[PDB]
């Protein structure tokens with residue numbers, strides 16, 4: 001209700017929007033010809049051919065470096081963020097994140113050198129690695145109870161919205177031949193300015209302030225969050241978190257202990273699976289894929305917007321599906337849902353698309369319809385729940401660190417997919433989709449045997465009615 005709580009919500013919404021923009025803009029810019037004329041002339045000549053050398057037209061490690069630099073940087077900067085928060089506060093790290101995005105935007109949009117372009121992407125990666133670590137800490141230490149899951153779904157919606165608007169910007173700036181990609185990459189500056197002026201107005205959480213000056217500065221800070229004077233009883237739980245100084249000296253061992261083993265294994269593998277489903281094909285190289293199908297320069301970027309629209313609608317209804325069905329059902333249904341689309345796309349590509357040539361109109365419509373359905377399968381299952389499950393399964397002692405490691409490893413696997421998708425496409429002509437399909441199959445089995453339904457179960461009830469009656473979680 002107060003200004004500080006709503007600022008806390010706004011900073012999270014904008015920080016998701018910027019992350020979605022950086023996911024969606026790299027696909028459109030890469031496929032444009034203006035960008036390839038100024039950074040990658042080797043693959044630029046290969047687009048001059050009508051339909052020669054399919055699947056290997058864009059096989060270039062530095063072209064993929066343009067996409068995966070941000071996520072490598074985020075993986076490196078995630079640990080730095082995890083330390084910098086606990087040393088300085090949740091406000092300075094957000095300020096540094098805004099500064100890093102603002103530096104990266106000017107570097108990328110006004111890039112004159114390939115080294116400079118990759119460095120700008122790397123600075124954007126620093127900013128996003130800091131933000132995706134400070135934002136959960138704001139949301140978990142300012143917003144009141146019963147609003148932990150409601151904020152996670154809003155955050156995971158903002159990324160889809162950012163992807164959609166990034167596709168729109170790319171589609172409109174693709175036609176602009178003199179400086180199109182520069183306009184496309186300058187659009188990330190607006191949410192960065194908003195983040196900068198939002199991170200200046202927000203003050204550090206009382207949990208962070210009590211870590212160094214207990215109630216010397218955080219006592220009034222907690223009163224500003226909520227206008228009720230009944231603070232003293234709410235405080236008594238914040239003190240207990242940092243009471244155990246000897247236990248928090250080595251936070252690394254608590255995750256390895258059997259107390260937090262069950263939610264750790266679920267949390268980490270969820271990041272491994274949700275990235276090895278193969279959605280980053282569509283979020284990063286969708287126009288690149290559509291051009292090999294045989295659509296053309298505008299047709300590919302125009303289909304990308306359609307798939308993004310599907311993503312947004314499926315996410316908006318996925319928030320209701322999560323509230324009406326259990327946490328298990330959606331991940332079981334999704335594996336089948338995604339397996340079908342990947343097999344259909346792969347099977348018809350293996351026969352109708354060779355090393356030179358183009359699919360016919362019905363085949364072209366099929367590969368688009370089923371990829372849209374593929375994305376909608378992921379938007380209501382692994383997208384949101386891959387972050388929602390670790391935000392509730394970990395116990396109070398290992399919630400912050402347990403989620404920090406999840407974000408970091410997620411960034412690592414994203415980097416793997418983004419750096420090797422086109423290399424895999426060249427080496428395996430149509431085996432990328434079957435390679436992803438095998439992962440989806442093991443996802444289905446892992447979900448059916450090792451993830452339970454945790455719908456409406458409190459943290460203290462996780463160890464009684466979730467992992468006690470489970471056949472495999474015996475870590476007690």
Ligand SMILES: CC(C)CCC[C@@H](C)[C@H]1CC[C@H]2[C@@H]3CC=C4C[C@@H](OC(=O)CCC(=O)O)CC[C@]4(C)[C@H]3CC[C@]12C
Nearest residue numbers: 309310311312313314315317318320321324376377379
């Ligand atoms: C672009 C795509 C992703 C749009 C998704 C819409 C569809 C996939 C439809 C087809 C079946 C629909 C579902 C069929 C039945 C219901 C029950 C329905 O319940 C009621 O209307 C009961 C009254 C109430 O409690 O609100 C709520 C919507 C829901 C989940 C529907 C939600 C939208 C669904 C999934």
Ligand SMILES: CC(C)CCC[C@@H](C)[C@H]1CC[C@H]2[C@@H]3CC=C4C[C@@H](OC(=O)CCC(=O)O)CC[C@]4(C)[C@H]3CC[C@]12C
Nearest residue numbers: 320321322323324325326329333334337373376377380
């Ligand atoms: C063929 C294309 C369009 C893709 C098909 C995917 C969806 C249209 C399907 C996949 C699983 C289906 C869901 C499976 C289970 C349910 C639960 C059920 O009702 C509720 O969710 C309300 C609460 C309750 O369970 O009582 C019936 C609708 C719904 C959402 C189904 C609606 C249609 C869904 C989303």
Ligand SMILES: CC(C)CCC[C@@H](C)[C@H]1CC[C@H]2[C@@H]3CC=C4C[C@@H](OC(=O)CCC(=O)O)CC[C@]4(C)[C@H]3CC[C@]12C
Nearest residue numbers: 328329332333334335336337338340341369373374377
């Ligand atoms: C668009 C046309 C050409 C075909 C679309 C294919 C799929 C995207 C659709 C149709 C087949 C559907 C599936 C058919 C059967 C089931 C089983 C049904 O029940 C179970 O999965 C078992 C019970 C449980 O797991 O809880 C859940 C919905 C699901 C996965 C459906 C989800 C939506 C799917 C994958």
Ligand SMILES: OC[C@H]1O[C@@H](O)[C@H](O)[C@@H](O)[C@@H]1O
Nearest residue numbers: 023279280283383386410414
């Ligand atoms: O919605 C798609 C996005 O979902 C996120 O959870 C993943 O981290 C991204 O790699 C992915 O592009």
